[PDB]
Amino acid sequence: GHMDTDAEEELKEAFKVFDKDQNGYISASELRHVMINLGEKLTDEEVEQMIKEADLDGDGQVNYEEFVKMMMTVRGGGGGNGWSRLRRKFSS
Ligand SMILES: [Ca+2]
Ligand SMILES: [Ca+2]
Numbered sequence: 001g002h003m004d005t006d007a008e009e010e011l012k013e014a015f016k017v018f019d020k021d022q023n024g025y026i027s028a029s030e031l032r033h034v035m036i037n038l039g040e041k042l043t044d045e046e047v048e049q050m051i052k053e054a055d056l057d058g059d060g061q062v063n064y065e066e067f068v069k070m071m072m073t074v075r076g077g078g079g080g081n082g083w084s085r086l087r088r089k090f091s092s
Pocket of ligand 1: 019020021022023024025026027030
């Protein structure tokens, strides 16, 4: 087995869902909407903190590249408290 890839489709599919606007850029607005829909009530501070951690250019928006790398790290590497919370409530 060890085929893997389950990440490519997972990250890609999820990313496509996160970016409702489909502009290729995730914003606190979309992130917050997803968190709320998940039955979670997080404050803007938590959302902003997540963007800052992932955002390396502080453009107020997270690009696909920032998402993939961030997801790759949080997986074994570890990230902030928000990303870890999402990556924790997901698989395990
Ligand atoms: Ca967007
Ligand atoms: Ca960014």
